[PDB]
Structure formats: structure tokens, C-alpha cells
């Protein structure tokens, strides 16, 4: 409570402060959660319960909880992957750092999924970086424990730019694939230092995808043409060459990215399989 001396305000959603423990000297992130009428918010209930079951080098560590505001105490990392991309915009991020970072995100995500947890908000602003060159999944407020097989879950999930097509077309069921999509959209955004699918609307987002990966038909993605928001009027665009879409990226790089951006979620590559892809044959830990 009184042990923490606030250094700076470092963001706002759901306010987050950088702070120091006055007795141990430890630097932390304080996520302040205001209550006051409805009790303890569903986002905090879910973020706390899930992070306590999720101990991974590549998942952000929750250090404590405090109760009329509620404070989440997390380990501090100085950088999010958006501020890092907006700093490498001109020069570009090095190939073997993109490979390290991807490899690490897939590792945390594999752990998440194997502990029956969906993130449902993978975007750069929620991925945190340290100085030793580690990256970590953050903001589990939009997460959820899921069953086998899944049942129908909240429709309004994932930031539009990273939203998976089966959510936009409003499939009754969605699962782990939707997080793999998100990382595909991220992988590409590191390679080409630009948002892959920066749509302003649910319709634009779909069309930006179709215009790049081609308009799905019953042969790519069986069942698609009878999905609740699929209209037969949609422009049938052709699939682009990945030479054009990710120009820098090697043959293995391309193979991994298409597999991560499959239309049919039952065919999309899993976090477990992705980790074993030949793209990851010579990984290191740069800075």
C-alpha cells in the first residue's frame, strides 16, 4: 500500500503507473482498477485468476493484488512492441530478432492454450519487451478459460486489425486459431514495419483480408458461404503472391506465415506445431 512510490504514469485502460518498492527497491507496474457500483469488474476477476495459473518466462508475471481501488502488481518491462516498431520504423527490425520474438510469443501462447486459456487481444501494445531481449504476453483482461469442445463465447473479441475472419463472419464457435491469426498479423507487421490489415470497419477489415489472401470459397474453407454474415455479393478477389505481401521474408518465413493466416480455423497451424516449423531451425536471443 504505502511501500510503493510512483515514478511515472505509463498508460491507461480498463491507469498503469511505474513504481518502486520503498523497502526492497524493486521496480513494478501498478494497474489501478476503479470500482465506484457493480462490484469487482469481470476483467480483473479473469485477468488475476488466469495469470496465477500461467507461469512462463514469455508470460508477464503478476507479483501481487491489493484492495476502494484494486491494484495489480506486475514485473516491469521498459518497452511494448508498438513503441519498439515505431522506433525501428526507418531502419527495420533485424531478421534474427523477428525470429527470436516470434519464437518467444508462440512459446507463451502454446503454454496459454495448453492451460485452456484464450488471450483474445494479441496486439503489439499488449506485448512487453525487456533489455536482455525477452518478449512477454500482457493484458489478460480480455482472456478466458475455454472448454473441450468450446461452447459459444463473447462475439466482440480481439482488436479489429488482428481480428480473425471467423469472428468477422460471426461463426457460432471460435477457439485457439483466433490467437494464431493475431500473431500472423503481428509477424507480418514486424517484417514490413506496417499493419498488415488496417481496416476502419468490420466490412473493410474483411475486404482488406480478401484483397490479400483471396476471397474464400467452399474449397479453401468448407461452410464459409453459409456463415451468418457471409454475403454472396462479396467481390471475389484473387490471392496475391507472398513475394509482394512480405517482400523481405525467406521461403520458410513465407511457408509459416500462410499457414498462420489459413482461412479454415481447423487447418490453421497451432502454437505447438508452429514452434516446430523449419523457419525456427537457427534461433538465438539478440537485443
Amino acid at each position: 500500500m504505502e511501500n510503493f512510490q510512483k515514478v511515472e504514469k505509463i498508460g491507461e485502460g480498463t491507469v498503469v503507473y511505474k513504481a518502486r518498492n520503498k523497502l526492497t527497491g524493486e521496480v513494478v507496474a501498478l494497474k489501478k482498477i476503479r470500482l465506484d457500483t457493480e462490484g469487482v469488474p469481470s476483467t480483473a476477476i479473469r485477468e488475476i485468476s488466469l495469470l496465477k495459473e500461467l507461469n512462463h518466462p514469455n508470460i508477464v508475471k503478476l507479483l501481487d493484488v491489493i484492495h476502494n481501488k484494486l491494484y495489480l502488481v506486475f514485473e516491469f518491462l521498459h518497452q511494448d512492441l508498438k513503441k519498439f516498431m515505431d522506433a525501428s520504423a526507418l531502419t527495420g527490425i533485424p531478421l534474427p530478432l523477428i525470429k527470436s520474438y516470434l519464437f518467444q510469443l508462440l512459446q507463451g501462447l502454446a503454454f496459454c492454450h495448453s492451460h485452456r486459456v484464450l488471450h483474445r487481444d494479441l496486439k503489439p501494445q499488449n506485448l512487453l519487451i525487456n533489455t536482455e531481449g525477452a518478449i512477454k504476453l500482457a493484458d489478460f483482461g480480455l482472456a478466458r478459460a475455454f472448454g473441450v469442445p468450446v461452447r459459444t463465447y463473447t462475439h466482440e473479441v480481439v482488436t479489429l486489425w488482428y481480428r480473425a475472419p471467423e469472428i468477422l463472419l460471426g461463426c457460432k464457435y471460435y477457439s485457439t486459431a483466433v490467437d494464431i491469426w493475431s500473431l500472423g498479423c503481428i509477424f507480418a507487421e514486424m517484417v514490413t514495419r506496417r499493419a498488415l490489415f488496417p481496416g476502419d470497419s468490420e466490412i473493410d477489415q474483411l475486404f482488406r483480408i480478401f484483397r490479400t489472401l483471396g476471397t474464400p470459397d467452399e474449397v479453401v474453407w468448407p461452410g464459409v458461404t453459409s456463415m451468418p454474415d457471409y454475403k454472396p455479393s462479396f467481390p471475389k478477389w484473387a490471392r496475391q503472391d507472398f513475394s509482394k505481401v512480405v517482400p523481405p521474408l525467406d521461403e520458410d518465413g513465407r511457408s509459416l506465415l500462410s499457414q498462420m493466416l489459413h482461412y479454415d480455423p481447423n487447418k490453421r497451424i497451432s502454437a505447438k506445431a508452429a514452434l516446430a516449423h523449419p523457419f525456427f531451425q537457427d534461433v538465438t536471443k539478440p537485443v
Binding site: T37, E38, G39, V40, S42, I45, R46, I48, S49, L50, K52, E53, V65, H67, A110, H113, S114, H115, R116, A145, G147, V148, P149, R151, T152, Y153, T154, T176, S270, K272
Partner: protein, 254 residues
Amino acid sequence: DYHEDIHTYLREMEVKCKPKVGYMKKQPDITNSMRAILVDWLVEVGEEYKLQNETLHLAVNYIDRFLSSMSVLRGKLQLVGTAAMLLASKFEEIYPPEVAEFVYITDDTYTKKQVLRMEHLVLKVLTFDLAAPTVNQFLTQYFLHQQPANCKVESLAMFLGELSLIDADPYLKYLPSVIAGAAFHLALYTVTGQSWPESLIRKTGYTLESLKPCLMDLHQTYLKAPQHAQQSIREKYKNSKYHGVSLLNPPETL
């Protein structure tokens, strides 16, 4: 598939999230009878507010974990289970019922303050561990091993799974994964004549031999089900939703 990963993790966490077997004896002002009335009431709340079967299973686990290490008086048991259902709702449900609704169903027995102040207390005692494995979680896994999906078997096994939430004695003496084992075999045997699939013997390590003790208790429970003081679960599984499986004639021997 990474199912095997999740199954291993659920089986591991069901032992850590399990309440203390005999905690009812330790309770001075409370009993199994009073617990069973509370649980039956939450089925009525569950069915009235069209909530998932997970939400119910989760609140009871929160209830038993809390009572395992907190003494409560009879005038307070309705507050604990209310605050339990509100949290299981906030966790599990796309549209969780709001506080003032959870108040209305107590009929103003307690205030908004009382319900909100008990939620804070229930989180503290449970140390914010809410992602506990339920009977339901294991059953839904077990259902993928029917060669022929049978919607009657599914509603009955679920039905049998809810019956045990009512009766501390003797279900607390069994792990969720085992109870679900009993409920599936008994549901399958009742409609088709078939038994515990080989594929689930491999997945779970449970033979019919290992399920015998839980099956014996669960069989009596199913037999004596229409004379139980508690009846909301039979009313719930009488709907066409669950194929009116509570009307089915139980088997006699096994």
C-alpha cells in the same frame, strides 16, 4: 490436438482445487441438509436466469472451498452461495446478471453492500483462484469418445452429474473426473446398454473396476431421485431442451 495437454492439467488442478472431505462435521451451525437446499436453490436461479451448467458447477466448488476454511451461521449461508454464483457468473458467462438482480432473488434478505462485501471476502479466502475444474468440464471431453453422438446420453450424464452437487455425502469424497466417469457410463448404459469406452480407459486410466464405488452411490442417488427432498434438477431436466431424460426409467442392476 493439444487436448491431452489440457486433460493432464485439469486432472492435476482438480486435486489442488478439491475441498476438504469432512468439513461439514467441523461446521457448528450448518449441515448437509442446509447445503443441499442452497444448491437446489442455485439450480432454480440457474434455470430462471438462463445461465450455463458450468456457472452452477463453479459456484458450488467456490461454496465448498469457502466452507472448508470459514465457519458460517445458517442466517449467512444464502449470502455465501449468492456471492459464489455472482463470481461464477462474472467469470463464466457472456452476460452475467448484475448485483441488484442477485439481490432481488434473495428477496431483499441481504443488501447490495452485503452481497458486494461477501464477494470481496470470497475472493480473499479463495486467493482469486476461480478457474477450477468441474464435473461438466470433464463430461464435455468424455462426450467426444461416443462413436455415435447420442443427445439423450449427453443430457442424462449431465443430469446425473448435477444430482451429486446436491449431496455433500458422499460426492465430496470423489474427484470431479471420477464423478463424470460414473455419470457417463451410467447415462450410456441406461439408453444404449454400452459401457465405459476403451478410448476413455486410455485417456483417463479409469477401469469400470476403479469407477465401481462412485457408480454404486450415483446409482442409488438416481434410483431414489424422485423421493429426494430436492427436485429442481428433475424439473430442469424434464424440458425438451434436455430431451426430458429425468422421466427415463433407471436401470435395475449392472
